[PDB]
Amino acid sequence: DPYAKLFEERVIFLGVQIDDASANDVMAQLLCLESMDPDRDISVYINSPGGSFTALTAIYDTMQYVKPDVQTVCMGQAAAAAAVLLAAGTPGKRMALPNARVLIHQPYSETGRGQVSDLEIAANEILRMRSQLEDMLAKHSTTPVEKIREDIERDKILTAEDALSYGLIDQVISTRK
Amino acid sequence: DPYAKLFEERVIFLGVQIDDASANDVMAQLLCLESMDPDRDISVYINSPGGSFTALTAIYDTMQYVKPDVQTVCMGQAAAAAAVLLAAGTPGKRMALPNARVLIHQPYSETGRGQVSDLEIAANEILRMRSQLEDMLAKHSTTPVEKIREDIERDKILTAEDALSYGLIDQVISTR
Amino acid sequence: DPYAKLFEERVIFLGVQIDDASANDVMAQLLCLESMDPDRDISVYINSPGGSFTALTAIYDTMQYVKPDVQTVCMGQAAAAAAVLLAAGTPGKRMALPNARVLIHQPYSETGRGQVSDLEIAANEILRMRSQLEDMLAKHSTTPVEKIREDIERDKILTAEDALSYGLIDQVISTR
Amino acid sequence: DPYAKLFEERVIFLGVQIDDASANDVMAQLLCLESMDPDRDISVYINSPGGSFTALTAIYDTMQYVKPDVQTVCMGQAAAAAAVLLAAGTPGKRMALPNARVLIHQPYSETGRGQVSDLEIAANEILRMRSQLEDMLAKHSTTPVEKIREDIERDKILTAEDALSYGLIDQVISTRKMDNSSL
Amino acid sequence: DPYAKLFEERVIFLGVQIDDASANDVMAQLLCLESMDPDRDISVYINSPGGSFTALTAIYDTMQYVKPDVQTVCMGQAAAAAAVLLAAGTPGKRMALPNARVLIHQPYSETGRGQVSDLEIAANEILRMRSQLEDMLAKHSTTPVEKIREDIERDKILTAEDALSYGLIDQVISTRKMD
Amino acid sequence: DPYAKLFEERVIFLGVQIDDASANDVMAQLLCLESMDPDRDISVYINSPGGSFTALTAIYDTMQYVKPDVQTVCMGQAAAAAAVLLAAGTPGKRMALPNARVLIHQPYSETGRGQVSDLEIAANEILRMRSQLEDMLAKHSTTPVEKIREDIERDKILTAEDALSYGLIDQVISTRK
Amino acid sequence: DPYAKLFEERVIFLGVQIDDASANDVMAQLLCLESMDPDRDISVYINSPGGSFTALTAIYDTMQYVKPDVQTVCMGQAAAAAAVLLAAGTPGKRMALPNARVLIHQPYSETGRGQVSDLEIAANEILRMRSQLEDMLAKHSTTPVEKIREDIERDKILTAEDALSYGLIDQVISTRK
Amino acid sequence: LFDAVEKAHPDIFNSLLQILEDGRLTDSQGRVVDFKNTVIIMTTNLGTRDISKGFNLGFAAQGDTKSNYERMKNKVSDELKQHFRPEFLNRVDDVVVFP
């Protein structure tokens, strides 16, 4: 089992869309690896589309909560919440593969039927979620907040070099040679 | 698996919805943890979007029964019953991660078609359940019962600082 | 897994609705536990929302048959069929958690299409089962049989103290 | 695994409806138990809501064939074909729990569409099957065959004591009793 | 596990529908049993309701090929292809339980839509299949083939002693204690 | 289990339809058997009703590539692609049971909705596939190619002796005596 | 099982549709094999009918990144993205069976409901992806990019010899003498 | 006297056959030693594991009216037949069970 060996060294691999179960698994893996050694470096590999915002916040807090450094590697794609997870790595060691792409846009939500007051409360919650996502993207990047407001209005697609110029990643790795 | 080793540490994880099966697993784990060592604390991580009321009562009673102090940490979210579980930890140990939320609202339920007497019995039971939830939230927090009664009338979303000012938690951790 | 640890301590855990499979598992576990040690008690934890009737009778007969005393603990809820099991423990050893309920009501059934004679036979059978149920509840409780007939006419929900006063519970536990 | 321990103590446990797979498992277990020890008794526990007829026939023949005596215990119910199995145990060693019910009725069958000749053949087969069931119930009980004829016309429900008076079972379990204990 | 234990003393259950997977498992078991010991009998127990014809022929050929004698026991029912498999045992070693039944009838078939030429080819194939079934039943029994043809027109149901007189089996076993 | 025991004796079953997974398992088994011993025969037992053409191609090529001789035995039936696999055994080592049948017919296919050019390309590919199949049948049999072309127009069913006279197999085995 | 034995002999086997899960499995296996021995070659066997483009890019980047040489073996078929994996092996170590086939065609995509602007960004992204695929084919073959652009307008089917002349493979396996 | 015979490998007693039936034993030097005037006793605890039991495992009605001695007898006989080959038990003159 290759995944067994990858987790055995330091590697947590995130290749499925972000929902509650996957977030719980990632959190458990991070806590276990921190329990093994609170001074080594954990690696997180992102090849997933977006997902629920609550799971995104849970994983973000979990990475920001432990001592061990988190090295984010983008591969294939990292869209929506996965982009924030990629940008949430410790500075200087957030990297992406040459042909990877990063997609960012504002959260999409769908509430059930309900009275007007319930919809107003839900709308306030959604707006504060969007503002919080904006703040997270601004904190971990070199781009000012207003430019992020302009960018996340619609779908924004960035290449590896474009992401590096944006400040989401620090290095684009080509080959081991 | 990471869950087994986390259990070996002394951490119970509750990231799934609250039903009979999850409550049974949590109660069994709590009993085993108390049996192995009745002095060291038990950590419970909450990431659940609420669930059934009976399972909530069972888990709450089991938590209050055990000798070891139960430290409840909220990460991701804690909605409805999960809020009660988070606030039900031993005082001085309840804590939450920085940008998490706690959502509280009155119970929601539905019943099948039946005569008026059965519907009346069900309505009395649901009112009793809401009152019991009110008392549980009141005694384990700071705000008076009247404000909570006026507050859970609609959905109430509290951030970490809002929960701390509310009294549901005790201190917000950024890093361990 | 915690369930193996509980079973090693002579604790049989019942947290699913009562059907043939669960009844068979419970009876096998009870027989094995009785054979292992005919002196120590056996604990049964009830967290089930009722079930069928023949499985109830099988479990009840097995509980009464085995030599060791049986301690039944109501935990979360014990509604309809399971309620009888809660009252079927050894007298003086029937326990319930504080925030737990016991629900009792007459049996509900469903038969398919058929001729009038078959439906008459089925009605006689269901009346016989209801009489058996009310007798079983009268035997293991301090309440007279007539008041039981009156009470189980509709749904009756009893809290821990209400069940204690009703007779199905011997004492209520709060904290070790 | 409690079922395993029940097996090493020579107990075959029948808790599901009677179909081909259940019949094969029970018959294989019976053959294994007979091979292990051809003199100690074998216990069969019945909690099934009836089943198919051919599986019933196979199990009945296997029970009658094996050398050791078979002790049948009725737990819960024995609805349609399980009643025959309960009554097919070794005489004097068939017993039931107090709050157990034994049901008996004539077989129910349905066939797909076909020409009249096929339906006539199927009806003759069903009549033969019912006659065989009547013979099985008459041989392993006390009441005469005509009483069985009249009884199995519709559903017949018997309690433990009613079944004992009917002759299907021999004793009614009450509670655990210790052995002789005399040195 | 009882099934492996019976397999240890060279006993095979055929208690499911006769299809490709069941046939493959049966012939694999038969070949293994032959390889383990080529001069001890192999017991085949039949409790199946029938199945396809290609699997029937494959199992029949594997039974005929192996050197050791094959003893077939009918336990519950043995219908259609199961009847042929029961009658295909070593002569004098074919047994049936007292209340068992054996059902024999001509093959049933169904084809999808197609042009008339394909339908004619399929019909010729089905008739060849029925003729092969008739020959197989005539070879392993003591009944003239004309009576076989008359009988298998509709569902022919035989009890244990009817099958014994019919020639499909050689013995009816009642109890072990009575030998 | 018997299957592992027969695998230890260099025997492979093909008892399900020919698809990607079945072909992959068969060729992996063939490669492992070749690597274990490169001069002992490998037996392939065929009880399949047909399958996809590409998987047939892969299995046939793997059979032709391995060094050891491959002996094919048709037991219950061998239809369409299975017939080609049966005829593709090592010459003189192809066998069938007495009550076995072999079915041969031209390939069948269906295509989704599309423009005329795509359909023309697909039709050309299907004609090429049929030509390849009849070439394979002609190479491994004692029958002229035009006779095969005429025969495989409709379903053709052959008994064991008919297959022997057709050249698809070499012996019919009755008993071990 | 044969697959474990093949993996022990440094053979990664790919006979399933290219999606996120299969790509993740292949990437993990490649990383494990590279870690175990950074000098021996790694063999990749292709029998897949194609798949998504993101998994294509991820697998291609990983297989280019590792230091050991990668030998691609086509068999049965290699369609669309799989074809690129056939042409992305180290030069001189890309080969195919005699009767294998290769499909090459432009990407097919589908977008749900959306406003005109979102569809505009989506179409721009699809065109960029098609241009990237064209460049990837041009880099690893012996054909000018204009010819590839004209060829991949519709489905193009290449036999083993046609692929050899096209430059996607270096040699054709015949047999083991 | 052979004390606690079940504690030994179940092959040592293969050397007792000629002792029990023929009354002789030959040592490695070829000399025949006569056992015809001795008394052979073998002590064992086999079949005495259920003395501290009050019932069987499954459901029961009456409760095995036989005393402990008969159950001990049957268990001892079964265990002896299971542990020793028939030809060895065919040469032992007496089997005595101690209540």
Account of the 3D structure:
This is part of a larger assembly, with 7 copies of chain A and 1 copy of chain H (99 residues). With 177 residues, chain A is of the alpha/beta class. Chain A is built from 7 helices and 8 strands. In chain A, the strands form 2 sheets. A 5-stranded parallel beta sheet of chain A has the order 1-2-3-5-8. Chain A has a 3-stranded mixed beta sheet with strand order 4-6-7. In chain A, helix 2 (20-36) runs parallel beside helix 3 and helix 3 (53-65) runs parallel beside helix 4. Chain A starts with a helix and ends in a 5-residue tail after the last strand. By secondary structure, chain H is mainly α. Chain H has helices spanning 17-22, 68-83, 86-89, and strands at 24-26, 32-34. In chain H, strand 1 and strand 2 (32-34) form a beta hairpin. The radius of gyration of chain H is 18 Å and the shape is elongated. The D-E interface holds D 20-21, 23-25, 27-29, 31-32, 54-55, 57-58, 60-62, 64-67, 117-118, 121-122, 125, 132 and E 2-3, 5-6, 13, 15-16, 47, 49, 75-77, 97-101, 154-155, 157, 173-177. Chain E: The active site is at 80, 80 (nucleophile), 105.
